[PDB]
Design a protein around this ligand. Structure first.
Ligand SMILES: Cc1cc2nc3c(=O)[nH]c(=O)nc-3n(C[C@H](O)[C@H](O)[C@H](O)COP(=O)(O)O)c2cc1C
Ligand SMILES: Cc1cc2nc3c(=O)[nH]c(=O)nc-3n(C[C@H](O)[C@H](O)[C@H](O)COP(=O)(O)O)c2cc1C
Ligand SMILES: O=c1ccc2ccccc2o1
Ligand SMILES: O=c1ccc2ccccc2o1
Ligand SMILES: O=c1ccc2ccccc2o1
Ligand SMILES: O=c1ccc2ccccc2o1
Ligand SMILES: O=c1ccc2ccccc2o1
Ligand SMILES: O=c1ccc2ccccc2o1
Lengths: 359, 359
């Protein structure tokens, strides 16, 4: 099986092509992770996936999506990850982390607590920041504050500090969160970026925050560990061909600036869109990016059916298959997939105290 | 669904009828549990089962099955369980523990490291103790040492200390391991017990170690927390009707001595047997014990098919259904079972950070 072939990128070797993408848990307190995350992540790692990417972890307090989001904006925050990283490595999975800044979508309720912007007089909330003072709309009506040049320098440096901390906590894979309508994505999109300075207008200017952040992170992130980003390459907003062309051009620039792999997503920059949800629907768009930017890729949405994952790899649409919700349902999904795809000694996807009994 | 009705025994209420029976992990070091067990057990608890019974935990070093077995023979051993107990309670499952002494089956290799008695000159091994100096045979050929009366008093006191420690570590459910051919089972069986003193010969004498151990444990175990035992009620050795009759009589004595529930098993006292393995094969034997001893029961073997579990409960064969291997395959089996049996809002079998997304 393609799904169970190892993958080497820089000095890191994944035991198979199953990636667990970042999945926010909304269980942290003032950014500090706890035994929710420890058990969740260690249990996932033991399930057999080759790569486990920790959830969106805020580079600054105001960059959290919600009051439950994980953070890495101080060394004490980073320390809390050390035992989790060590547990993921003990299980033979590669520990990764997505570092993030929610931008205008920040200061929101947890998804099961309303999923909407927090009320102005709720003591948990905070002012959001963004390229331009324009609301997302819908359930996120808060107008963010337009960033100053010093705000841009400060957030870039927060990404650097976050990557340095990730490195020193022992992560072997980093993912910059430039997708899903959060800060980075919103600098790229003309929908959310109306700036008239060096960080808006032209393609070069809209790309600038993302390229500068990548370059700054590259200074502290070891050249021998994969440097990745997640990026929304289209919006399904009636501007898809033009948006894809520009997104692919930016992916070429990312590659030239040392990006090792791109996690290809949808932008979610604005609500008025028509996304054609379906099993593996991103496969063709991921394949186009892979081909036209000559960059390895992963993507997600509906690959919990093992045969879809296998088919995407065999068709060279993806290099890794990211499988999210199926892993919340069953932390041992990789074992399920191994059985489905006829892997010999499938139960040894799991550690011995499980594997021995499941032959 | 019957499977998802709560169950109250003494002051403890289980949120459903799914029990995770004790399952040895063979991952402890000198009896001390570690983050293997922490993550394994906390992850299981979060999966939704109402009751999680920790693996056979040795009351004394020589009572371990293997060098990987958990122990509770000192206060420092008991301390290692405290954070695990607290994590199980945080997940809403009831924490139980099986306390044990492997008897003549002790000093064995881990199951994936040969599963057989450890060689005499291996520095990990130890002398085994038993009612009589008779080997199990087959892959367990070591002849144990015949216990003295002082050995019997000492092992009883080790069970007491173990139960006291379990109590103080916060366990809410205890299970005495009188099954599977280990020490307690071997005192009951005429195959393994040839003693000529007060602890062998007659039914009363063969019962004596088990009844005295239960009574001694009862002195330190809170009356408001379930006091249970696992016991092999037949061997499939051509003596089943006589053996079942005596086993049921002993179950009546256990009930009269404060036992709240009996986990009904097979003896595994000797190897030369013909066990009729099959899905839910223990159901009829468990039902007979339940009826004839008028005692609540659980049993196990093949109840990972949710419909078998439901049928056993509806037929009043069992009060709780123990589901072992299916939980090694999928820690979230209870969610799977909830979907299969049509539970409303089945995903809320799991905690919010999973449930919300799986509706
Ligand atoms: C509970 C949950 C939280 C998520 N959190 C994030 C996140 O932290 N970062 C991100 O880039 N995507 C996040 N996503 C998107 C997932 O990484 C993934 O792309 C999506 O679930 C689709 O894959 P699937 O169909 O396999 O679930 C989240 C999805 C879920 C279900
Ligand atoms: C990995 C493993 C370890 C076990 N350890 C014990 C144990 O510690 N104590 C015990 O009484 N039974 C033990 N058993 C028996 C199980 O509790 C259970 O009775 C058996 O697995 C049958 O149920 P199942 O068909 O649902 O797996 C163990 C079984 C397995 C698979
Ligand atoms: O980047 C993100 C962060 C959280 C999240 C939750 C549900 C679906 C998608 C998501 O994407
Ligand atoms: O996959 C594994 C195998 C062994 C192990 C030991 C301790 C903790 C985690 C582990 O994970
Ligand atoms: O294995 C699963 C189970 C449930 C589920 C629900 C939504 C999306 C993906 C899923 O995968
Ligand atoms: O009591 C026990 C202890 C360990 C064990 C392992 C496999 C099957 C049954 C078992 O029973
Ligand atoms: O089921 C649960 C729900 C919440 C929770 C929080 C911390 C640790 C474990 C938990 O389990
Ligand atoms: O769900 C499962 C999966 C595998 C398995 C193997 C042996 C016994 C029970 C099992 O249950």
């Amino acid at each position: 099986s393609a799904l169970f072939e190892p993958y080497t990128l820089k000095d890191v070797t994944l035991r198979n092509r199953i990636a667990i993408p970042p999945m926010a848990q909304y269980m942290a307190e003032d950014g500090m992770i706890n035994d929710w995350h420890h058990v969740h992540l260690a249990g996932l790692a033991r399930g057999g996936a080759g790569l486990l990417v920790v959830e969106a972890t805020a580079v600054a307090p105001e960059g959290r999506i919600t009051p439950g989001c994980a953070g890495i904006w101080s060394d004490a925050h980073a320390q809390a990850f050390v035992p989790v990283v060590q547990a993921i490595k003990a299980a033979g999975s590669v520990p990764g982390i997505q570092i993030a800044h929610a931008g205008r979508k920040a200061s929101a309720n947890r998804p099961w607590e309303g999923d909407d912007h927090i009320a102005a007089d709720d003591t948990r909330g905070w002012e959001t920041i963004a390229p331009s003072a324009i609301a997302f709309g819908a359930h996120l009506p808060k107008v963010p504050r337009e960033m100053t040049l010093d705000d841009i320098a400060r957030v870039k440096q927060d990404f650097v500090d976050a990557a340095r901390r990730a490195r020193d906590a022992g992560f072997e894979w980093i993912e910059l969160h430039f997708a899903h309508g959060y800060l980075g994505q919103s600098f790229f999109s003309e929908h959310s970026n109306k700036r008239t300075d060096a960080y808006g207008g032209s393609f070069d200017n809209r790309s600038r925050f993302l390229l500068e952040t990548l370059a700054a992170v590259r200074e502290v992130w070891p050249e021998n560990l994969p440097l990745t980003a997640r990026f929304g390459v289209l919006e399904y907003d009636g501007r898809d061909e033009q948006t894809l062309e520009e997104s692919i051009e930016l992916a070429r620039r990312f590659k030239a600036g040392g990006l090792d792999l791109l996690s290809v997503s949808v932008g979610f920059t604005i609500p008025d869109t028509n996304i054609p949800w379906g099993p593996a629907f991103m496969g063709p768009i991921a394949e186009r990016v892979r081909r036209e930017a000559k960059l390895p890729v992963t993507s997600a949405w509906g690959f919990g059916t093992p045969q879809l994952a296998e088919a995407a790899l065999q068709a060279n649409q993806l290099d890794l298959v990211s499988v999210g919700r199926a892993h919340l349902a069953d932390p041992h999904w990789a074992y399920f997939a191994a059985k489905e795809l006829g892997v010999e000694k499938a139960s040894w996807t799991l550690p011995a105290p499980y594997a021995h009994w499941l032959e």
